[PDB]
Design a protein around this nucleic acid. Structure first.
Lengths: 257, 119, 101, 69, 88
RNA sequence: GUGGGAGAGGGUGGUGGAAUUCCCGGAGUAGCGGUGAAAUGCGCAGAUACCGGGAGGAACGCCGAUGGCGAAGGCAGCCACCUGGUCCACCCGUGACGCUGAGGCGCGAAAGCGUGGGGAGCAAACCGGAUCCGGGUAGUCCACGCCCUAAACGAUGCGCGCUAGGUCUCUGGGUCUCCUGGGGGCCGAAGCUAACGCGUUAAGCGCGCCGCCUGGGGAGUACGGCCGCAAGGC
RNA sequence: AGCUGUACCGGAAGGUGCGGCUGG
């Protein structure tokens, strides 16, 4: 246990700050969290596990319990409901891995006025690590989770806290939601489509990806090659080299042609 | 309606379902049958009981056309082969010849994942 | 300059004229490539184990030739041009190994 | 009993003597194992080749249909 | 393949004396013939890696025999290499 | 050298059907299809079960073995051509011409890349369902170039000599119930090993040459160099 | 069943495709 202290330290939580917890479970997290924040609100789903939670949190009064999932709920509604005087909001969810991946994004495209998230992930998928372009870890997911925020892994964790014994190591990643988009965007839809078209076959050359994966494409060989020429991107360069600024520029190029 | 009076029967006995079809010597089918027409749905369609029923269903819609003599050719490796056989044998019909015609590949196309790991 | 056996399977549904014509066509083709026939045997018509070109019957001819090796393939290519011939098979003539003494 | 014993002298490499070759075939068009045929290693191997040759020529069946229960 | 007649003629055209069949000269000539034929084969058939190993063995073996012949007696070595047209 | 033998060794040029899918006709039709159970999905422009006629792709069922070949990776429908290695008998020829091998050169399962074709089935990623099933792109295939990794293993480098046997099996030769070569396994003398075990196919007794080790983690990581379009490799 | 080379994961206390091994 007691990892909670170090995670909270990396949360930079203050008294003025409020906290949202998505997978509180037994409330051990909430326990050590309570002594640091004025407002803590917990989303909860398990009808079975709720009664045991209700009585255990009796000592601390600053807690709030909400009985619907993050998926089918308006987070902004809760923020306006409870966080009226609070300065900024952190999130310290430690829920099972297979659930965490969509919800983190979902909180991001909606562009809530929340600053950052501190969350537990698998080591390998640490928002695909630092998302430095020339790496294996670099991906479409990375492009998503740096288009909206600045992420870095503060530390990792072997061994176990909750489960008896896992097989893989875990990490903790810390976030700040950025004020605006990284670079000007003509469309979100086209941009995201271009990302998936580039990353559909990672090993294949960028030119092949654009020609094949992107709709039409076969009729626009000359057009695609020309536009990538004015973009100052080499045809044989792979998707894993292009960066955010690059993809922006390429997306701008591809539209209006 | 055909009054061919003598045809051949085909039994496709799969793992999940059993289908029987009667046809003329030419090869134009006159009627069939299936666990589905009986009224059974889901797993029970594969269960031999539905075979015990569609068995004679063939026969009946066949007496309906006035056929007497039958040739039986069976396919597949369903659990309900043999009991379906004894069935359309004692549905009231004179069976001439019964043959197994389960089609096997001569190491051709690659099967499902479920049907790999063969040594 | 080796010895080979040639098996020809052709259409049984022929009269004297057509089948004869086919015989001299095959003979001429075989002769042109510098081959030399030694024995010719004609087993007429034998039931086929399975239909070949939608016919449960065929006419078999057997040739014992000896000729240069390099041309062999070429001959096999030419004997298959006729629509009547159904199967062509050229094999090295090898010694009759006997068992069950 | 084994097939080999209950026969006369014959040729293995002769891919045309059908009435001896069929007796090396099962009710289905399959080559019998060494157990059923009682042949030595080399003669079995050459017999397989002869079977394949005659079988391609159309004298022997690729398969047959067992008539039983 | 090498038929009997040409192989023979190679033996009795390079024989040091009547009935000589095992001298260095005969071995080298036979290897040269085999190498020529096999090299032609590879010139036509590019993607035959297996026979390339045999070719390498042949070249090495012939090289060893020439090395021995040169070490033992020079003039006969030069006569042989001129007669066979080795090394260009 | 002469006379013979076996074999999924390799490359090239072709044809044989079983099966899946699609198309064109016939007849017939209320459901097919799937799991431990179920649900997506296909069908009145009439599906599956069926018959006949075409198209195309990939692989080669019994034989098939504990079997064979190759230096390894690996190699099975059949025929033809070109070609490598190897074994035995004769004991005919040369007279040490041999072994090993740092670098170099070549080969190198699968996965992956480039320039073009092809695409039946299966299937990463991906699209849906109950929370394994139905589809589906790359890929698997061919030609030419790259990539050079592994439980690339017998976890056992190569060559030669000596040291009890028994049994099974593949393939040769003789004076044929046995004798004598070359392979593949199993029990075991002496001996070796920490033990398991090895034991004429040594992990025994020795000689020759090459490669590699110096406690675990950090780590096959960092920097540098070489190779490659890239992933990456040394 | 486990291990392993490789190639991918926007429902990653690991999952799957192509192989390979018994150190099951």
């Amino acid at each position: 246990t007691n990892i909670l202290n170090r995670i909270v330290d990396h949360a930079e939580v203050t008294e003025k700050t409020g906290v949202i917890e998505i997978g509180p479970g037994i409330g051990a997290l909430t326990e050590q969290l309570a002594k640091r924040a004025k407002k803590v609100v917990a989303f909860e789903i398990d009808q079975r596990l709720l009664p045991i939670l209700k009585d255990t949190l009796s000592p601390y009064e600053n807690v709030t319990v909400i009985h619907q999932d993050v998926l089918k709920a308006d987070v902004k509604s809760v923020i306006e409901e409870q966080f009226q005087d609070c300065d900024e909001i952190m999130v310290v969810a430690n829920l099972p891995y297979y659930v965490t991946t969509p919800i983190i994004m979902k909180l991001l495209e909606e562009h809530l006025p929340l600053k950052g998230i501190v969350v537990m992930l698998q080591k390998e998928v640490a928002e695909r690590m630092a998302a430095d372009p020339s790496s294996k870890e670099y991906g479409s997911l990375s492009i998503a989770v740096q288009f909206y925020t600045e992420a870095k892994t503060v530390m990792i964790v072997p061994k176990t806290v909750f489960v008896p014994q896992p097989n893989v190591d875990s990490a903790v990643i810390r976030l700040i939601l950025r004020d605006g988009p990284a670079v000007d965007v003509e469309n979100e839809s086209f941009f995201f489509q271009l990302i998936k078209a580039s990353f559909a076959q990672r090993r294949k050359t960028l030119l092949n990806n654009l020609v094949n994966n992107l709709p039409e494409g076969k009729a626009q060989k000359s057009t695609i090659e020309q536009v990538l020429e004015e973009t100052n991107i080499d045809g044989k360069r792979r998707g894993e080299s292009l960066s955010i600024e690059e993809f922006a520029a390429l997306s701008n190029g591809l539209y209006k042609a | 309606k055909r009054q061919v009076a003598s045809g051949r029967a085909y039994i496709h006995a799969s793992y999940n379902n059993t289908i029987v079809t009667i046809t003329d010597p030419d090869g134009n089918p006159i009627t069939w049958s299936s666990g589905g027409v009986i009224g059974y749905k889901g797993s029970r369609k594969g269960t031999p009981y539905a075979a015990q029923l569609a068995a004679l269903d063939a026969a009946k819609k066949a007496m309906a056309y006035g056929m007497q003599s039958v040739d039986v050719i069976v396919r597949g490796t369903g659990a309900g082969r043999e009991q379906a056989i004894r069935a359309l044998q004692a549905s009231g019909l004179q069976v001439k010849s019964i043959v197994d015609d389960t089609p096997v590949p001569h190491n051709g196309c690659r099967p499902k994942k479920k049907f790999r790991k063969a040594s | 300059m080796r010895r080979y056996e040639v098996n020809i399977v052709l259409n049984p549904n022929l009269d004297q004229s057509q089948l004869a014509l086919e015989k001299e066509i095959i003979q001429r083709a075989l002769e042109n490539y510098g081959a030399r026939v030694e024995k010719v045997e004609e087993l007429g018509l034998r039931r086929l184990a399975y239909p070949i070109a939608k016919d449960p019957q065929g006419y078999f001819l057997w040739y014992q030739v000896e000729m240069p090796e390099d041309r062999v393939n070429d001959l096999a290519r030419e004997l298959r041009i006729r629509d009547n011939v159904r199967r062509v098979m050229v094999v090295k003539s090898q010694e009759p190994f006997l068992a069950n003494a | 009993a084994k097939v080999k014993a209950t026969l006369g002298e014959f040729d293995l490499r002769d891919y045309r003597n059908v009435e001896v070759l069929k007796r090396f075939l099962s009710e289905t068009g399959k080559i019998l194992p060494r157990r059923r045929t009682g042949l030595s290693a080399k003669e079995q191997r050459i017999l397989a080749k002869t079977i394949k040759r005659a079988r391609i020529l159309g004298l022997l069946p690729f398969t047959e249909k067992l008539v039983r229960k | 393949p090498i038929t009997k007649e040409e192989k023979q003629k190679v033996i009795q055209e390079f024989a040091r004396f009547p009935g000589d069949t095992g001298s260095t000269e005969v071995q080298v000539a036979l290897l040269t013939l085999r190498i020529n034929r096999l090299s032609e084969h590879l010139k036509v058939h590019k993607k035959d890696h297996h026979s390339h190993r045999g070719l390498l063995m042949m070249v090495g073996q012939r090289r060893r025999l020439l090395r021995y012949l040169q070490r033992e007696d020079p003039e006969r070595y030069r006569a042989l290499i001129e007669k066979l047209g080795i090394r260009g």
